[PDB]
Design a protein around this ligand. Structure first.
Ligand code: MYR
Length: 188
């Protein structure tokens, strides 16, 4: 919902292994306009490959993300959510903390007030848990059985209020201050 959030994505999707040149401003107009035209975020293969190709030229249409697309695995009309695919992409690439956070909170801060609800947290945790294959999921600890018990706990951690709201700072200071949340929000 803002060019700023585009920057955070630049450095992130940049160190990953690709190399997008489009400044953060471009992703801003493209992102919104992209989800604005689509229904809610459902895209097809013929379309995704085109986005990953332009976003990352020197990287081969099958370098890293090649696996991600597999994890999701379509299952209806041959389409898949894009927003989730993105968040998943970013969250898990393995990197600093506040980097993926401030980006996640800003990503949900579309254009209205300036806060995020529990249901939103769950959506994210669902994006990563799904990003994981039912095979590597058996290795995860027991305190992560499902995005439901994992999101609820996180909420009872920095939320301090059942079904409440988190502000930009709160969210950040919530993961940085408490190590648990940080380990319950940033992938493993
Ligand atoms: C508000 O306008 C949020 C804008 C965020 C833009 C960065 C996300 C767009 C890049 C997604 C990467 C997809 C790789 C195929």
């Amino acid at each position: 919902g803002n060019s700023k959030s585009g920057a955070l994505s630049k450095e992130i999707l940049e160190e990953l292994q690709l190399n997008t040149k489009f400044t953060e401003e471009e992703l801003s107009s493209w992102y919104q306009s992209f989800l604005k035209e689509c229904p809610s975020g459902r895209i097809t293969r013929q379309e995704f490959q085109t986005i990953y190709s332009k976003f990352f030229p020197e990287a081969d249409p099958k370098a890293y993300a090649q696996h991600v697309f597999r994890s999701f695995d379509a299952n209806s009309d041959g389409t898949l959510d894009f927003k989730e695919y993105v968040i998943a992409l970013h969250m898990t690439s393995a990197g600093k903390t506040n980097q993926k956070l401030e980006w996640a909170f800003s990503l949900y801060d579309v254009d209205g007030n300036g806060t995020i609800s529990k249901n939103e947290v769950l959506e994210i945790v669902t994006a990563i848990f799904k990003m994981i294959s039912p095979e590597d999921t058996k290795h995860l600890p027991e305190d992560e059985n499902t995005p439901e018990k994992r999101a609820e706990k996180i909420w009872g951690f920095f939320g301090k209020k059942d079904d409440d709201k988190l502000t930009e700072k709160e969210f950040i200071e919530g993961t940085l201050a408490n190590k648990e949340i940080l380990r319950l929000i940033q992938f493993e």
